[PDB]
Design a protein around this ligand. Structure first.
Ligand code: ZN
Ligand code: ZN
Length: 243
C-alpha cells in the first residue's frame, strides 16, 4: 500500500553520480525526474536513456534539456562550447524523448516542475520571498522543484512570514503531515552547496515523510570522462568542490 519514491533532479549527464544514487536509494516503487538530465556532464546520452526507462510517470523538462533540443547548422569557433558539445551528443531518440516532456506535472497531492510553479523551466526558489510568491502558484499540498542544485524545504506559513528555507542534512527526515511545502531534492550530478556528494530525496506519501540523502560517488571517474571529452577545466574542477 505504502510506496517509496526516489526523487532526483539535475543529473546533468553525470552517469557515475546517477548510478551511485540508484544503488544508494534501495528498493523504490517509482523514480521521478525534475529535469536537467543533460548539460555540463560527460554522459548525456546514457543519462537520458536511463531516466526515460526509470521515470515513466513523472519526468519534467529542465532549462538545459530545453536548450539542447536546439538544432544548429554549424559550417565553428562555437564548437568550443560545452553547451554546443552536449547538443551534438544527442541522437534522434534522445531528442524525441526530451521534446516530449511536459514542463509541469500535477498528480494528486503533488505538483512537480524544474524551477518554480510560476515559471516552470526558469525560476530559482532559494529564499522566502520567492517561495512566498510561489505558494499561490500551485494548488496541491506539495510542490517539488529543482534547478538550484541545493536541497531545500520550506512550509507555506514560514514562507509567508519570511522565515528562511531549510537546508536539510544527510538523513534528515521531514514530516509533511500538515501544511503545504516546497521541497527540492538537490542535484544528483552537480551539487552547488559545498558538499560534493550527490543529492536526492525519498518520498513516502503514505507515511507523509520526505527523507533527504547524500551519497559519495567516484568524482574522479566523471572528471576523467569529462577530460577525455575535452570539456572545460572550470566545469571539471567544480565537481570536487561541490560548487
Ligand atoms: Zn540544473
Ligand atoms: Zn537548472
Amino acid at each position: 500500500n505504502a510506496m517509496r519514491i526516489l526523487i532526483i533532479s539535475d543529473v546533468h549527464a553525470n552517469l557515475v553520480a546517477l548510478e551511485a544514487v540508484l544503488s544508494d536509494a534501495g528498493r523504490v516503487d517509482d523514480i521521478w525526474s525534475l529535469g536537467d538530465i543533460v548539460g555540463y556532464g560527460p554522459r548525456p546520452r546514457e543519462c537520458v536513456e536511463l531516466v526515460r526507462v526509470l521515470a515513466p510517470n513523472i519526468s519534467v523538462i529542465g532549462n538545459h534539456d530545453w536548450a539542447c533540443i536546439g538544432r544548429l547548422s554549424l559550417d565553428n569557433p562555437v564548437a568550443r562550447f560545452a553547451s554546443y558539445w552536449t547538443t551534438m551528443q544527442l541522437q534522434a531518440e534522445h531528442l524525441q524523448y526530451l521534446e516530449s516532456l511536459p514542463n509541469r506535472m500535477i498528480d494528486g497531492d503533488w505538483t512537480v516542475v524544474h524551477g518554480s510553479p510560476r515559471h516552470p523551466i526558469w525560476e530559482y526558489i532559494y529564499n522566502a520571498r520567492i517561495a512566498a510568491l510561489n505558494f499561490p502558484a500551485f494548488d496541491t499540498p506539495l510542490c517539488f522543484v529543482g534547478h538550484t542544485h541545493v536541497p531545500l524545504y520550506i512550509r507555506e506559513d514560514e514562507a509567508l512570514s519570511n522565515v528562511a528555507p531549510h537546508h536539510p542534512n544527510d538523513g534528515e527526515v521531514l514530516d509533511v503531515s500538515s501544511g503545504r511545502y516546497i521541497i527540492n531534492p538537490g542535484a544528483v550530478g552537480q551539487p552547488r552547496d559545498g558538499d560534493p556528494r550527490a543529492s536526492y530525496a525519498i518520498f513516502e506519501p503514505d507515511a507523509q515523510r520526505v527523507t533527504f540523502h547524500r551519497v559519495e560517488y567516484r568524482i574522479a571517474d566523471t572528471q576523467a570522462q569529462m577530460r577525455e571529452a575535452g570539456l572545460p577545466e572550470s566545469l571539471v574542477t567544480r565537481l570536487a568542490a561541490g560548487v
